[PDB]
Design a protein around this ligand. Structure first.
Ligand code: NA
Length: 292
């Protein structure tokens, strides 16, 4: 056809039918996107902007085979799902920080609601690492929702929703990384909180700018890119390449770590992530909180 929706589906390798607007189809699209479109911020670390507009995001993701951060990849996913015919809403959320022992002061997370024939879900392709849902989560307070990455749980209290996870044990064969700031040691992790108040993309613009410029922003502190695989997740942070295999053995995830040279990053970006940059990346591994 040459249509934009068909271009997007080609980008994510989705070759199936999209005529049934059901949970199976929604899940399949989510899965294809998270296995194709990385969660990344490498433009920041190449001296370029993180654009918020859909035309620019569609070009960079669909035509230039890039990914983006949540404000980008969920904006695109929102457009695609809506175009396909799903009943969609943009939502805003607040990300948990272990060191801060609280959720972000500002609304730094874009996620989606999809309503299908009497059930309500959240859908998010922009958490990445081992925080990334592989299926839509039903909006049912307190219910365990087991998935390949982990068991997720949504809880409602006083008009706020709280997304948490119960994580597996971790096997780290390269013990030179045991003390890495990248590792979440607890099996219980708060991910983010949000409300069901409908948003527009305009609501995220002030944060879109500030997250690119503030020395306080994790996004200026660490350069990263993440992509889900059929059984795990690849994530590069700074010069540190990781690969997690979910539930490799006995309720345990395996996490491989390797240090890359500057010269090795370009080939990894292409071969593992299908990322080809426009300019030279300056990899960074600053001190701000970001676990894999
Ligand atoms: Na909508």
């Amino acid at each position: 056809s040459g249509s934009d929706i068909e271009a997007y589906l080609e980008r994510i390798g989705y070759k199936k039918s999209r005529n049934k607007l059901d949970l199976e189809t929604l899940t399949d699209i989510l899965q294809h996107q998270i296995r194709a479109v990385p969660f990344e911020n490498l433009n920041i670390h190449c001296g370029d902007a993180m654009d918020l507009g859909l035309e620019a995001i569609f070009d960079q993701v669909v035509r230039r085979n890039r990914g983006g951060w949540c404000l980008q990849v969920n904006h695109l996913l929102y457009w695609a799902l809506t175009t396909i015919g799903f009943e969609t809403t943009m939502l805003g959320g607040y990300v948990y920080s272990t060191p801060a022992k609280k959720y972000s002061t500002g609304m730094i997370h874009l996620l989606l609601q999809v309503t299908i024939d009497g059930r309500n879900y959240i859908v998010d392709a922009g958490s990445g690492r081992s925080y990334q849902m592989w299926q839509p989560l039903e909006l049912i307070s307190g219910k365990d929702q087991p998935q390949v990455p982990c068991v997720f749980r949504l809880t409602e209290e006083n008009g706020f929703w709280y997304l948490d996870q119960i994580r597996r044990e971790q096997y780290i064969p390269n013990e030179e990384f045991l003390h890495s700031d990248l590792l979440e040691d607890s099996k219980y992790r708060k991910i983010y909180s949000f409300t069901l108040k409908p948003r527009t993309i305009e609501d995220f613009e002030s944060m879109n700018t500030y997250l690119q410029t503030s020395p306080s922003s994790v996004f200026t502190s660490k350069s990263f890119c993440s992509l889900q695989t059929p059984d795990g997740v690849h994530c590069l942070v700074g010069f540190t390449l990781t690969h997690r295999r979910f539930n490799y053995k006995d309720n345990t995830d395996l996490i491989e770590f390797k240090t890359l040279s500057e010269e090795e990053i370009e080939k990894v970006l292409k071969n593992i992530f299908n990322i080809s940059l426009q300019r030279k990346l300056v990899p960074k591994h600053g001190d701000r909180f970001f676990t894999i």
